[PDB]
Symmetry: none
Subunit: 663 residues, 3 copies
């Protein structure tokens, strides 16, 4: 690849009419297509010394007896701008020569317009290593030979910013560093494979509902590049025993081919792909990936933002895209502060079989610094079939028992699970999760329009406080029945809008919604009050109410106090048809509980079309302590004389024994 | 045009102080700013032969008596690999010159550098047919001019993965076939137009809504390219009687231009538009179509993913973009199994005048192979004005196909309209649908956040069973009351939460919800119970209920036995202000029904500010069957004695008649 | 500061064995790889003069005594159109030198081959200005250098369709006009800013709260382009007291670096960015703005879709991306019609502290014609922390001067802002607005799934009448009490839903909801009767109801008429616990109000487990008008006889005084 010729240096100037050097010749260098004898048309001429300094010298340069440019009798190297007009005069004023444009004398005059007519790019097929192709690049790069690599190849992009375009395969095990790539790049169409074929478990059925026994997981274990992920540390908690049953070789594998962009600003990655691959941005500011298409995951998170080293990061996004498999969280954010701008977050993501989370905003002190995420935005994202919380949006789940937290506010300032992360959550969906579905804890944010369904574990494990929720929909969750209820919540919340009651009714404890420390309104379903625990259930906005009782022979409305009893109401109100169905008449029974039994005390209105309201009486003599409301009479009986009598408390307040009726 | 200048390629070396050649001298070139005599500082030197042989030579280059470098008696051209320091020694051994930094680029062999330095792309202005450009392409292909085609351009890309950029027409009627494309190819900006102006109808009124006649339908026929679409087989079944009226060339119209892709992996098409154009992938897997520039539809469907032959459809997406018009379904998917990964379907879309559907998986068997689809997701899709079903997500029709459906769950395992589709539906939107804006059949789907407003056609035809349904918001559908049912589910699903009724539409007052077979909850709106027909309308997860009355002098809470009467209530609780309002005094009546008339039988408390309990009695002598509660007395009047008697059912079970009151 | 060396361009030809020039020698120029001494192989040779003129010359080129080519004595420069082989002979005919390929390739074939092979593009560095580059462009225009422009400079394109991969910075002060772009032209990676930094006001502090005092606003005055915004005319009205605190320099200037396109069709601008940016689109159809790179804004509109010049606009979208600080409304819309496609949309946009609004429409006549906007779409778009209204989708408009519109329809004919336009709205959000979360007027609109949440200003302020809204949520807005309410409708609308109160409603101060003529329905939350004030609220579509208590000794099914009282009771069914809590027995009282105080008159059932309905009686003589129902009786107390008597109305309807209870 020799490109530079060993030409004669220190150029020789020769007379135009004899083979003689122009001794004491005058040279003028000036603007293109201008006369350089006039001083206003001249351009600077610099000498270049032993140490690289460029020093401007006077314009008429002296040609000596040999034909070369001397400054003070000593040879020099004169250097000027690319285009100039040169004029050589002899010592007697005769014009030796006049070149109007030196650049128009190069042998290849097609090179100029050929350079300024086409578009620059370089192909990997013509170069041995990727460093040579990266160095030779100016505008774009083309990957068309499948490149083998290992763990440790760094390639520098010289500060120049390009449009990387990839159209082939990358193979090899290890990490490939992209460094010093400028503001505003594009990297499109990456593919990422590995050499060896690791062992991945198969923890779901042929009918795709989850399989929970560790022995069958070990039975379905096979070496492949798809249809499974290698087990992780959290799967050991998820699957007990599976640590011992699995043979030791498939434990703690680190077979990862990954591409890491090391502290680059504003690099966009488009349509990322590659099975069991890894893609991570380290310290990247305003760098996002844009509709990555179905890459299978390995050990490293397929979408990773790692901002731990150096300054806090901001602007990292995951726009659209869909990712498949992955032993850890597919999209893991690390130490991102969105600022008042509300930067950072995910858009339109689809996740599938993420080892931990479709998105993991990392929680607590991770490594030597914090890992929390602030002011991020999450909307229109879907997680299907994960192992843990598809939107794990909490920052202080279990860790940091100490009152302080490194590089962050202490617990003494803001308490555990109760933090101003201030994320933006909307329109998110979880389906088919094995473990918990949505985990999130903080203070002062507002979450809305969650949809979690068909969850083997508890579809909602919320642990926040002072957080308002609207149009939430956790339906058909906890279906394997790990937990006694669908949704756990620790601190206080104020839900405005929810729906419950699914195809598989919960039977773990006969308790659907358990927020006894929290205030919930808008609960939808025929679910019994004994299966509900709240701190406040007051749908205090309802207007004119009418009750439909479809499929029940009597119309039922229940008024319940849970201080007295749970499964039993303080009072019930039924309407029953007076006679056979279609009678056109129906008496109204209003009953209350007495002696741990409902329907023991009841009043009847128009009992079998009697045009009268029933008035009960005390089976014994009415006691003075039984009735204490003045100006009222309590009826009672005397079986000895077989007649009604009244214990009358006058409006004055005294007790009189009058005779209601005589035989 | 000047293209190559005559110059001498042989360099000439001369003395420093005289005009004489360096006779039999030596030249050492080495690293920048180093003495080149040491072998450690020496850089390689290559003889560049007349063909480009590049044969390496030893370091001290020998100069001739003419000042030119020689090797084996012949003149040579020496090329090196980088900038060098030159040291020129006279034959005696004296330093002619030393220069620390010199670099002059080789002015020849530019063809090699051009092939290594630019981006390859072929243009149609340089080739007569598309197949020539296909054969000549290696990296890109630019449609710069307007291409005619016939039905059946078979074009082969030979397996090279390309990016087919487009900047002009694809005009013609029929099909264009792109064959043998590598994984990851791209098409962008392709736009087509049929050569012949077709006969299109105007099945809508320019001041909103559709046409429901036959006279004006034929009166609005025009030959155009926009503002109208082609009649189909199933337009006469929506506009009764056109079949004997249209032009014969209009019926069975072939006027369509299509983009047909056959058996290739991972080929995306971007921002494709077209007048009377449709894009049909045939047997293609892992392909998508990122947005669109509003193509105008033709006879065939606009977006058509078809996979009957060979394996099923997988990874087959529609992301973004809007479409206009079309005789058949806008987005159709045939025989697509998304696998366990659930890869396939629409993520965001916008449809107008979607002649058969915004999205439709064709149902049953076509040809000799079933057309059923598996794991198809549908998010963020907005359709407006579909002539037919808004999203035909079903897989089985009403007419019974061959029993034991091949390649599916057989009719012995799973009956008609009873299939697990395992689909995901969320954030839908409908406006102006003359068709049934949503319709699907299956077993155990989980539909969420559909929303259907302002449709001349029926709101919903849901033919699944025991599924999950959520927040259907039916808003003035059936403006002029075509059919009876707006929302109708044929199974035992749970439609948790809904909303009905816009300004005025039920069917004409007369039973929207024809769903007496599903356990529904969360319903709200301005829909009458006589118009509600559900299996079990019980929202019993409620709490302390508030009843705020606006526009009512009274306050009402009703509980109804509908089988007694659809329009009449069984019982009620009313708060009625005695005399005039503003008193601060309103009495409470607990009321039943007797003889199909409300407010005939009741108990009243503070009635007309009486401070007591108003209770009626039997007008004539009460019988022993009207009172059926022990330890309770029913009052009644005796007109013969003009007094009160009381039938007192004792707790012992006996009845005694006592004079309740007599002066 | 210099790149090329000062070399002698003129060729000198010397002998190959001795240092003597080829005196009076011959140069023969022929075809590639042949013997040029044959006249048949000889190619044309041309003298190239200084000024560029060519003169075809006879072939045997004379070399004079100085070794330079001369024709008429004077030195010349010989050039050929194609590659050549050269043979240099001495005066005696001995061949001095032969070369068979001067450039080792022939550029005359290779020009055609490279024209056919490579991709076309011009660069900005090769040309001084942008107009000459645009005239010389064919397909692509790479902007590889920062370009200094000035306001109002116009660059034409001649109608060529090009992609402009805007690649470096692009700076200047004012508007830059682009014209004459064909369909499919694309701009990508562009970046605006200007030289002069403005005076910017910073009315927000760390506490996530805004500064409302004018001196507090002026005390945050910076010289910057980001983290602030330029004061305008509207901030005079918005900020009371700001009209005199600012210095004279800080108001009245207009800085906006805008890339404005003029009378173009189908031009997309991808991945736009820029500090203090601006993008004005004029006379545009089918255009888009695909994504964005959060361009901070300037004085003028930052996405200003205008169609003033020509006809009405059609199809101008903003897809995805995001945006940041600005001085006026983020998206303007001027004079665009949607036809029937509802064309003109903003989708997935997350604007942020726009100076006035994230999206808004204009009104009146501005410039040269009217400036209204009908039939647009706004889906999934989000504006967080604006200053004025969150979305101004107000197309029927609220012009404070005379209501009739110029060149349009009246308002005295068309009720307070009436025009059926049917803009589509779904999944919109506002947070932290100082204006309002929603503003739009229309008849027949259908608006769904809005979640306005946590704004300093009011939740909404409508201007519609007869338009339907569904799943509406407003949460915890209006902390400063910007309006007198949180949600307002200024007409007769139907609001199918409202989910209120997260933590606060005003300061708890009254008038939470306003609807003087509008019917609302289906509301749920902690809202109270004193907070609700609508025209109507009737929820008749629901089913069976249950009263549930938690931590209370009471269960209250409570009916209140607001004609009677706001906080007092009109009637209720209370249920309390007999004796101590947890006894298993509970009593129930049907209570009414007597004397503007609750529980003054009631019936008590199971009072102290007596199983009896307590009957209060009139303490005085029961008057004739106290009881009026036939076949009834009213008890009363006689103090003179201290006895319980009864006024009995016979079933015929006549009164009689009898003795109820007396010993």
């Amino acid at each position: 690849t020799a490109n530079v010729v060993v030409s004669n240096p220190r150029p020789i100037f020769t007379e135009s009419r004899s083979f003689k050097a122009v001794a004491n010749g005058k040279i003028y260098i000036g603007q293109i297509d201008t006369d350089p004898v006039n001083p206003a048309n001249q351009i600077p001429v610099y000498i270049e010394n032993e140490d690289g300094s460029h020093v401007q010298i006077t314009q008429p340069l002296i040609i000596n007896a040999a034909g070369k440019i001397v400054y003070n009798g000593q040879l020099v190297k004169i250097v000027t701008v690319q285009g100039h007009s040169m004029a050589i005069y002899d010592a007697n004023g005769s014009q030796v020569d006049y070149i109007a444009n030196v650049l128009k004398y190069d042998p290849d005059q097609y090179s100029i317009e050929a350079d300024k007519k086409f578009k620059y790019s370089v192909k990997l097929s013509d170069y041995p290593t990727l460093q040579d192709a990266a160095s030779a690049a100016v505008d774009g790069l083309l990957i068309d030979r499948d490149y083998n690599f290992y763990g440790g190849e760094t390639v520098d992009f010289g500060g120049k910013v390009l449009t990387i375009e990839c159209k082939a395969k990358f193979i090899g095990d290890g990490n490939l560093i992209f460094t010093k790539l400028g503001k505003g790049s594009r990297i499109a169409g990456v593919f990422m494979e590995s050499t060896t074929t690791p062992w991945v478990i198969k923890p779901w059925t042929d009918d795709n509902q989850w399989l929970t026994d560790a022995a069958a997981v070990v039975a379905t274990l096979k070496q492949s590049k798809t249809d499974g992920y290698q087990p992780t540390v959290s799967d050991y908690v998820k699957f007990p025993g599976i640590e011992t049953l699995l043979p030791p070789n498939a434990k703690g594998q680190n077979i990862t081919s990954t591409l890491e962009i090391r502290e680059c600003i504003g690099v966009e990655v488009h349509r990322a792909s590659g099975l069991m691959a890894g893609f991570l941005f380290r310290g990247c500011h305003f760098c996002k990936m844009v509709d990555a298409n179905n890459p299978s995951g390995g050990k490293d998170g397929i979408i990773t933002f790692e901002n731990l080293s150096g300054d806090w990061g901001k602007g990292n996004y995951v726009i659209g895209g869909r990712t498949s498999y992955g032993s850890v969280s597919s999209a893991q954010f690390l130490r991102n502060n969105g600022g008042f701008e509300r930067d950072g977050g995910v858009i339109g993501f689809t996740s599938y079989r993420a080892g931990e989370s479709g998105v993991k905003t990392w929680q607590g002190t991770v490594g030597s610094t914090t890992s929390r995420n602030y002011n991020l935005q999450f909307r229109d994202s879907v997680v299907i079939y994960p192992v843990w919380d598809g939107f794990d949006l909490g920052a202080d789940t279990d860790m940091n028992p100490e009152l302080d937290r490194p590089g962050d506010y202490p617990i003494t300032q803001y308490p555990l699970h109760q933090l101003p992360l201030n994320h933006l959550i909307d329109n998110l969906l979880v389906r088919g999760a094995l473990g918990v579905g949505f985990g999130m804890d903080g203070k002062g944010m507002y979450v809305s329009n969650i949809t979690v369904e068909d969850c083997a574990g508890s579809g909602a494990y919320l642990l926040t406080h002072e957080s308002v929720f609207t149009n939430i929909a956790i339906i058909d969750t906890n279906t394997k029945d790990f937990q006694a209820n669908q949704i756990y919540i620790s601190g206080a919340c104020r839900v405005n809008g929810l729906r419950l009651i699914g195809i598989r009714s919960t039977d773990g404890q006969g308790l659907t919604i358990d927020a006894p420390n929290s205030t919930v309104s808008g609960i939808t379903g025929m679910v019994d009050p004994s299966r509900i625990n709240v701190a406040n259930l007051a749908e205090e906005g309802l207007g004119n109410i009418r009750a439909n009782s479809f499929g029940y022979d009597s119309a039922a409305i229940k008024l319940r106090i849970h201080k007295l009893s749970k499964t039993l109401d303080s009072g019930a109100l039924y309407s029953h048809i007076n006679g056979g169905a279609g009678s056109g008449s129906a008496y109204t029974q209003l009953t209350a509980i007495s002696g741990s039994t409902p329907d023991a005390v009841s009043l009847k209105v128009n009992h079998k079309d009697c045009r009268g309201a029933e008035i009960p009486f005390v089976p014994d003599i009415a006691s003075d302590d039984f009735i204490k409301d003045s100006s009222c009479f309590l009826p009672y009986w005397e079986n000895n004389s077989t007649s009604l009598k009244a214990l009358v408390k006058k409006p004055n307040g005294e007790l009189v024994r009058l005779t209601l009726a005589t035989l």
